[PDB]
């Protein structure tokens, strides 16, 4: 089940979430995949991932599972990155 938009988790991005998105984006850019930012002279996939995450231009969705089994989807752009 999905909790509509009456979600109650945290509006910020955890360290584990940041690591997971950074790794997934780094792998995707390392393979032949489109990049939605201006490389601007960067050639390391991880740094490209951080550059994409700088202005929240990563089309990834976080699915936070409740212990019961329900889950709510959080977009990357709507997650505050303070860490």
């Amino acid at each position: 089940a999905i909790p509509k938009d009456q979600r109650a988790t945290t509006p910020y991005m955890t360290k584990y979430e940041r690591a997971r998105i950074l790794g997934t984006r780094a792998l995707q850019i390392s393979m032949n995949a489109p990049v939605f930012v201006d490389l601007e002279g960067e050639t390391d996939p991880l740094r490209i991932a951080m550059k994409e995450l700088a202005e929240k231009k990563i089309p990834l969705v976080i699915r936070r599972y409740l212990p019961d089994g329900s889950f709510e989807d959080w977009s990357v752009e709507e997650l505050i990155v303070d860490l």
Partner: protein, 171 residues
């Protein structure tokens, strides 16, 4: 006899096609894969209707690699040989083993101990055919076949038919 179902197929899209047209890519992949597939559980997927209607969901990215798996929800016409019914077919081949009756996209085989003793193999006529009293079946003829085969669904399905009892002829 044909059935309309709500089957589902999982496609693992590569990140190389993670653009704005990945939806249409999945659409064409579904067309080129599901059509002509002789799935044992279901049968033949003749065609998929409502192309501009089938919906995709959020694709889950596998932990191992960046490829994403999509669980599409399509509906299509499915043909299953099934078991325990009569059906009309048209012959396409004949030999001493039997006649290859064809029903739709099928080729049901009839063995020696299936048809009654009122059929003998001969090649006197132009088409090699089983000829006897009041039975005339040829390469192209009408025949009603009752299916009693075990199908044996292993990546493909089959059928075995019978000619015993009346009404199972040309008519």
């Amino acid at each position: 006899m044909f059935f309309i179902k709500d089957l589902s197929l999982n496609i693992t899209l590569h990140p190389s096609f993670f653009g704005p047209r990945m939806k249409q890519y999945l659409k064409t992949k579904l067309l080129e894969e599901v059509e002509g597939s002789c799935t044992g559980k279901f049968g033949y997927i003749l065609c998929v209707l409502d192309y501009d209607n089938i919906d995709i969901q959020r694709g889950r990215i596998l932990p191992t690699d960046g490829s994403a798996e999509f669980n599409v929800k399509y509906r299509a016409v499915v043909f299953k040989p099934f078991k325990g019914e009569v059906v009309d077919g048209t012959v396409v081949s004949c030999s001493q083993h039997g006649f290859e009756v064809q029903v739709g996209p099928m080729k049901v085989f009839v063995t020696k101990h299936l048809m009654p003793q009122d059929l003998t193999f001969n090649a006197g006529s132009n088409p090699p055919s089983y000829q006897s009293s009041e039975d005339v079946i040829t390469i192209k003829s009408r025949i009603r076949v009752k299916i009693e085969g075990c199908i044996s669904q292993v990546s493909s399905i089959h059928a075995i038919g019978s000619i015993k009892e009346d009404y199972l002829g040309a008519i």
